[PDB]
Design a protein around this ligand. Structure first.
Ligand SMILES: [Zn+2]
Ligand SMILES: [Zn+2]
Length: 253
């Protein structure tokens, strides 16, 4: 109870998503799709296992056309098989939903909270501003904001357990949050999540898809201050190049 660090941080592939390249660089003219990774993260901690995000909804399985009839039509195409349903991922890894200590929702976009309905008992940690936006903004799916789950609504920065900190990073979505994790093997790790899809969104401040790009920039600024102080390893949300060098399950950091 001694532990200031998490035992293991796993990067867990949870399917993929086609995004128009204008999502990763808002200046690009639409018309080329990128097959970007979708992630969830598994933390093995002294208090129990913690899952960060829950993949895509069952409606996306074998259904690349999910975003027909919406703003995302032809620009967002989920790449999800039956194997990528979060319960299946978890079962292969070694867990059932009720085994988890917490779920952390970085935000409620379909590629992060599609699986939330699987977890009916586990507290789901989500920002108030994200929860309230999800009750109306139309980039949100029904599946991402089911009414009777055990939500643990928080406001701003928050310590989940020792070694697991949430950093409020709104802009990509109204209540987006990133993670700062201290691991036994690696020390300080910053999971930007979608506060930057790619390394150039972060380092070069290349604009990318978001609810409020001005806020997204300030959140990036704030992360840069944390980086200056902590010098962490930094992992981006939907980065095909960085993915190439990521250690992924069963490897951990
Ligand atoms: Zn998102
Ligand atoms: Zn995302």
């Amino acid at each position: 109870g001694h532990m200031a660090t998490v035992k293991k941080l796993y990067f867990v592939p949870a399917g993929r998503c086609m995004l128009d390249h204008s999502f990763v660089n808002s200046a690009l003219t639409p018309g080329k799709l990128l097959n970007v990774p979708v992630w969830c993260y598994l933390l093995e901690t002294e208090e129990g296992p913690i899952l960060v995000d829950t993949g895509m909804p069952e409606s996306a399985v074998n259904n690349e056309g999910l975003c027909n009839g919406t703003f995302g039509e032809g620009q967002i195409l989920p790449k999800m098989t039956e194997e990528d349903r979060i319960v299946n991922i978890l079962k292969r890894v070694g867990y059932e939903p009720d085994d988890l200590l917490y779920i952390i929702s970085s935000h409620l976009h379909f590629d992060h909270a599609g699986g939330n309905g699987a977890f009916t008992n586990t507290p789901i940690i989500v920002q108030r501003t994200e929860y309230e936006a999800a009750l109306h903004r139309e980039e949100y799916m029904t599946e991402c904001i089911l009414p009777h789950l055990n939500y643990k609504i928080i406001e701003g920065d928050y310590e989940v357990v020792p070694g697991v900190q949430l950093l409020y990073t709104p802009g990509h979505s109204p209540g987006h949050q990133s993670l700062f994790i201290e691991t036994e093997q690696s020390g300080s790790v910053l999971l930007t999540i979608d506060a930057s899809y790619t390394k150039e969104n972060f380092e070069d401040e290349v604009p990318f898809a978001g609810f409020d790009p001005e806020l997204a920039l300030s959140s990036i600024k704030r992360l840069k201050e944390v980086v200056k102080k902590e010098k962490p390893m930094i992992f981006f949300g939907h980065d095909i190049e960085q993915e190439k060098s990521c250690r992924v399950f069963p490897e951990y950091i």
